[PDB]
């Protein structure tokens, strides 16, 4: 996250860092004690069996107690395609279950087809790259625009200041009045360009889907 702020510590107890040999590469959202929700671009292309999933996480360069840490059972993913940018979403099902406490919650996703309008105000988050890369959770406004969007995504827009989500934001919910409605997908120009939204796979048209599969 580029211009954005340190979270207080466990204050977005649904969010994830997907690791390997010890290191962030994405984030993700726990959607249920035992499934994970992450960008499919984050796992093409990786050893998926190699992927630790860690929750109960805040500052990434800390041995954190409040930490729980699992691995890839099974993936699950939607028609994920990288040459249109769509269904950018994968279900990944944990090893176990996750312990619900202060530090590790499920997230409260939207009703299905749910379109966000031009203007709402949501939080992106993440470990990614500062513009160094995040010890420390970030957190950041953005406001959902249309324009320089496609209707196969959520996109959001930081106005008079260039501030966004970057690499290792991967994957990464936006929570928009309280639900995840995003996933983080893609960005244009650079990071942070000030020109071009920052584009979210849209967690509200897979809905039914995600319900499918986690029950
Ligand atoms: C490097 N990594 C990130 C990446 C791409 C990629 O293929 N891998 C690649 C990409 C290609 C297809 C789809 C689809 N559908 C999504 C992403 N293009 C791209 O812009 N990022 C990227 C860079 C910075 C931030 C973010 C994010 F936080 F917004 F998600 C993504
Ligand atoms: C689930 O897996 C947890 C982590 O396993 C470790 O990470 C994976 C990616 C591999 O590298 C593996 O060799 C490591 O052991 C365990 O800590 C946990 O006990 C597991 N839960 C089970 C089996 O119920
Ligand atoms: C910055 O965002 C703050 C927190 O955002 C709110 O809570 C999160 C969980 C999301 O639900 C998001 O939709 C909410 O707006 C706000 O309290 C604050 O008003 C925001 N400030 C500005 C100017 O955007
Ligand atoms: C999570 C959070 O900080 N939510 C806040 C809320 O407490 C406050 O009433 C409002 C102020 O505009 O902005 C939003």
Redesign the pocket.
Same mark, same amino acid.
């Given at each position: 996250i580029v211009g954005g702020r340190r979270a207080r510590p466990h204050a977005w107890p649904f969010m994830v860092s997907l690791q390997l040999r010890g290191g962030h590469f994405c984030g993700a959202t726990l959607i249920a004690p035992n499934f994970v929700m992450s +960008? +499919?671009? %984050?796992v @093409?292309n990786v050893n998926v069996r190699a992927v630790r999933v860690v929750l109960g996480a805040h500052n990434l360069s800390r041995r954190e107690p409040t930490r729980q840490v699992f691995a890839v059972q099974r993936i699950f993913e939607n028609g994920?395609?990288?040459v249109? $940018? $769509?269904?950018?979403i994968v279900i990944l099902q944990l090893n176990g279950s996750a312990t619900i406490n202060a530090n590790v919650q499920v997230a409260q996703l939207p009703a299905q087809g749910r379109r966000l309008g031009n203007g709402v105000q949501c939080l992106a988050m993440?470990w990614?790259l500062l513009g160094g890369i995040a010890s420390v959770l970030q957190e950041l406004n953005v406001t959902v625009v249309t324009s320089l969007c496609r209707r196969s995504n959520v996109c959001t827009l930081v106005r008079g200041r260039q501030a966004?989500?970057?690499?290792?934001? *991967?994957? *990464?919910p936006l929570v928009c009045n309280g639900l995840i409605h995003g996933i @983080? *997908?893609?960005?244009?120009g650079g %990071?942070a360009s000030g020109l071009y939204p920052? +584009?979210? @796979?849209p967690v509200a048209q897979f809905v039914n889907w995600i319900d499918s599969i986690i029950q």
């Open positions: +960008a +499919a671009h %984050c @093409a994920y395609d990288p249109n $940018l $769509l269904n950018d993440g990614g966004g989500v970057c690499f290792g934001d *991967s994957g *990464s @983080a *997908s893609f960005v244009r %990071c920052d +584009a979210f @796979a």
